[PDB]
């Protein structure tokens, strides 16, 4: 519309703004003052129609976002780069007989040692710039400015948790879709059939069986067997919310919950699995709209002409931009009746959060300091534990 | 030389690696793991053929590498730039010619002189950046990483010291070859002749001799003479190592009256005293492999297009590059039969090492710390003392 209001014309006069004094190397020095009227507009009180509108409160809403897999996180010393692991293969006890060659007492019997070698993690970073002169214009107390400087920092702590939780639930779906053997994969037909298969596959763990681990794709576990058991204190179902609302809605969940394990807290579920994307073709960055889209989510370091390798992850919705279409797929389970039952010790996850406040660079030209947050996180998944995937594929 | 071994194909996959995690803005963020098999490889053992091999031991050999010139170092203040020295040139007496007119008394005969204006030295610089992200992917003990961070720092001072002796050596040799008189040079013919011409070049430095110095290269001394002696507690002989070895094993060990005439207390010696290069013709930098060759010796700041002035000094073997041939000549004697017998206190050498360890710059974007080392070193040779060169 259009407004011929005496106060709205004063409001919309942008040549008087504070931004004019900070986007020009020479600017206005002394203030004459302004006539402020609250008549026949908003901000109008019944008494004293000539005062400036005043703030009752300003409220920093700071939500503590949590990583649900944080109790799995071991902490290492960030030294070397290859973590390896190994088991001892089964040798079943044999009957003894007193009528043998009796120089087989001299014979040897070594253990057999299935292993697997893991690479490194990656170091991740994020920064935030806080200045000292222009952000003071909009808090009216020192306490609100310090709460702002602290809320920015705790948001930078919280989105690390969001990143790591979304990253690990992308790992556990990428694993089961692509890398997992089709011996651990059971196939369902309908939702009640899948519920009965999930509830019999929980009970297919806690059993001394060499059938449910992928020790055959360890380095030395191709011949022989390796028997794994799993308690119920370390079994986790990873599924969707539309299917957790059906698994918990059965009488078997009630008899698990009564006098026993908390079955609500062993079923880790999400809305539908995957907001994380993968790169399949090594592309480059060509357009400014994609650069600004990456700047919106805090990715400051990437510029035009940067190449993205095959297998890089993004952790937000990227596939709508012109040069990402086709080059980028999604870690999303096919035929969303989906449940992946694992032992929680299979997630080999360790970090290094020792010294993640690197000391600030001041930049006293603009008086805008910058704090960086560096952390090393190693995400892997071990083959020596019971895993079952129940899909319709 | 083609290998189809599966562990060698696992090692040959450069897509899985620490490098493409640290080259790109985005990378893979989890590891599924790889089947490592030690069978039919260099890493194979008998009982367990499936583990990754182990280091127990990681050494860091270190050496301190002293200077052999820093008794000559005068700790200056590093203020002002132009230093000067002078002598008063010799005026011989003349005969009393009484037939000249008597107003010869009123004419003034000012004492003439010979100066030499030196100038500034060179502020010299080196730095080293230690990483906190990818250096820690090596060094399986934290003690080894701290030993590394210290050994780099202690190597920087070692190749300050060897650089300063290379520059003192090259200063003396380049001053022997390009500046001198016709009087100062001698021509030896062999190793047995030079070891006696050195002995008879001493006993010539300590005569009242208007020759043997280079005041004709001083500012006011182009016409006139200047006499100087030495004291034999001030004479330095700069030879190669073959000549000092020859003296000590042959000439001393084949004489009986060695109790008086041993001059090897005054002899510094070098194994090969040409390795340092100069510039002629004033080129510039245009080739990529040349600056990649320069980066290996620590010179980080040179880009392409940078020009090199007509008197710069390179201090390592540099004449093989594509740009530098014809422009760069080596400071060396052409015969390996060499002796420069000069006076000490003809070699001024003032370095300044006070504000030297400058405070570091933590670079937390890349999580790294750069340390700098700065020193100001002035080195020069005075033209007012006795010098004799013996070469071919």
């Amino acid at each position: 519309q259009s407004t011929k209001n005496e106060t709205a014309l004063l409001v919309a006069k942008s040549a008087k703004s504070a931004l004019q004094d900070f986007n020009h190397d020479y600017s206005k020095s002394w203030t004459f003052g302004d006539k402020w009227d609250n008549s026949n507009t908003m901000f109008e009180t019944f008494v004293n129609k000539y005062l400036f509108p005043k703030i009752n409160e300003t409220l920093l809403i700071d939500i503590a976002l949590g990583n649900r897999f944080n109790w799995l996180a071991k902490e290492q010393d960030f030294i070397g780069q290859y973590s390896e692991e190994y088991v001892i293969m089964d040798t079943v006890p044999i009957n003894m007989d007193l009528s043998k060659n009796e120089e087989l007492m001299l014979k040897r019997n070594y253990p057999r040692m299935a292993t697997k070698l893991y690479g490194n993690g990656i170091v991740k970073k994020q920064k935030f710039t806080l200045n000292n002169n222009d952000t003071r214009f909009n808090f009216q107390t020192l306490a609100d400015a310090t709460n702002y400087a602290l809320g920015v920092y705790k948001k930078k702590i919280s989105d690390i948790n969001v990143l790591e939780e979304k990253e690990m639930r992308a790992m556990l779906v990428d694993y089961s879709l692509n890398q997992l053997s089709e011996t651990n994969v059971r196939k369902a037909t309908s939702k009640e059939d899948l519920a009965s298969k999930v509830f019999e596959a929980i009970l297919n763990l806690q059993n001394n069986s060499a059938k449910y681990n992928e020790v055959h794709r360890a380095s030395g576990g191709a011949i022989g067997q390796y028997t794994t058991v799993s308690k119920l204190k370390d079994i986790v179902i990873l599924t969707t919310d539309s299917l957790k609302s059906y698994l918990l809605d059965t009488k078997i969940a009630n008899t698990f919950q009564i006098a026993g394990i908390d079955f609500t807290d062993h079923v880790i579920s999400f809305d539908d699995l995957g907001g994380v994307f993968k790169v399949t073709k090594e592309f480059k960055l060509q357009n400014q709209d994609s650069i600004d889209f990456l700047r919106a989510y805090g990715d400051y370091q990437s510029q035009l002409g940067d190449t993205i390798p095959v297998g890089a992850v993004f952790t937000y919705d990227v596939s709508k931009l012109k040069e990402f279409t086709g080059n980028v797929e999604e870690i999303k389970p096919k035929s969303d009746l989906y449940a992946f039952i694992l032992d929680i010790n299979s997630i080999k996850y360790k970090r290094y959060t020792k010294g993640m406040l690197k000391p600030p660079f001041h930049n006293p030209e603009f008086d805008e300091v910058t704090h960086w947050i560096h952390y090393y996180s190693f995400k892997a998944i071990s083959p020596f534990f019971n895993k079952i995937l129940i899909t319709d594929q | 030389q083609s290998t189809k071994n599966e562990t060698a194909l696992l090692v040959a996959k450069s897509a899985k690696s620490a490098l493409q995690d640290f080259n790109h803005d985005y990378s893979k963020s989890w590891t599924f793991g790889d089947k490592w098999d030690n069978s039919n490889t260099m890493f194979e053992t008998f009982v367990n053929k499936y583990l990754f091999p182990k280091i127990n031991e990681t050494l860091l050999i270190d050496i301190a590498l002293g200077n052999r010139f820093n008794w000559l170092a005068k700790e200056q203040d590093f203020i002002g730039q132009y230093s000067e020295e002078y002598v008063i040139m010799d005026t011989v007496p003349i005969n009393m010619d009484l037939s000249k007119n008597e107003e010869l008394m009123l004419k003034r005969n000012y004492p003439r002189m010979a100066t030499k204006l030196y100038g500034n030295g060179i502020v010299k610089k080196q730095k080293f950046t230690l990483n906190n992200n990818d250096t820690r992917f090596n060094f399986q003990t934290l003690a080894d990483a701290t030993n590394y961070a210290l050994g780099v720092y202690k190597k920087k001072i070692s190749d300050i010291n060897v650089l300063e002796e290379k520059e003192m050596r090259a200063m003396l040799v380049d001053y022997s070859l390009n500046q001198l008189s016709e009087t100062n040079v001698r021509k030896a013919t062999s190793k047995e002749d030079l070891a006696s011409k050195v002995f008879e070049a001493i006993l010539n430095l300590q005569n009242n001799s208007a020759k043997y110095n280079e005041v004709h290269r001083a500012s006011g001394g182009a016409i006139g003479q200047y006499t100087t002696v030495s004291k034999l507690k001030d004479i330095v002989i700069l030879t190669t190592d073959s000549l000092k070895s020859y003296l000590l094993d042959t000439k001393i060990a084949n004489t009986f009256q060695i109790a008086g005439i041993d001059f090897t207390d005054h002899v510094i010696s070098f194994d090969d005293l040409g390795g340092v290069f100069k510039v002629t013709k004033e080129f510039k930098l245009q080739n990529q492999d040349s600056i990649d060759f320069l980066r290996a010796y620590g010179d980080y700041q040179s880009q392409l297009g940078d020009t090199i002035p007509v008197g710069a000094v390179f201090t390592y073997d540099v004449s093989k590059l594509k740009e530098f041939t014809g422009n760069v000549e080596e400071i060396k004697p052409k015969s390996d039969l060499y002796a420069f017998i000069l006076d000490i206190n003809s070699i001024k050498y003032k370095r300044y090492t006070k504000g030297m360890l400058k405070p570091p710059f933590h670079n937390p974007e890349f999580d790294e710390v750069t340390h700098w080392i700065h020193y100001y070193s002035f080195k020069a040779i005075s033209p007012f003392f006795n010098k004799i060169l013996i070469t071919d």
Partner: peptide, 27 residues
């Protein structure tokens, strides 16, 4: 093992690792 002047400026203390104080929020 060999110290000399081991605890030098910021990097020689940065490998002698520093201040596990802030960890991630859940546990």
């Amino acid at each position: 093992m060999y110290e000399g002047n081991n605890m030098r400026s910021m990097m020689g203390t940065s490998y002698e690792d520093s201040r596990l104080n802030k960890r991630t929020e859940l546990n």
